[PDB]
């Protein structure tokens, strides 16, 4: 194909959800919301990554939403643009 995900295994929303097993207790966004927006836990801090574009997001602020941060910083992501 003409597009290719940065992380094929994290193609699955269920796989992405599992990656949050050790999501830190201070991190306020839910695994459900993050995984739905294409994001999985990198295992470092509150840093997540998109399976599709490979962009990383960290240092989440109150009022941040997963999708709106993903679209704001990585607008040309195929997952963002396919939503």
């Amino acid at each position: 194909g003409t597009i290719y995900p940065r992380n094929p295994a994290m193609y699955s929303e269920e796989a992405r959800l599992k990656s949050f097993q050790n999501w830190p207790d201070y991190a306020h966004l839910t695994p459900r919301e993050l995984a739905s927006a294409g994001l999985y836990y990198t295992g470092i801090g509150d840093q997540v990554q998109c399976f599709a574009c490979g962009g990383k997001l960290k240092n989440w602020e109150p009022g941040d939403r997963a999708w709106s941060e993903h679209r704001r910083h990585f607008p040309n992501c195929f997952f963002v643009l396919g939503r």
Binding site: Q47, G55, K56, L57, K58, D64, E69, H73
Partner: peptide, 4 residues
């Protein structure tokens, strides 16, 4: 959030 902050992007990388």
């Amino acid at each position: 959030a902050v992007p990388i």
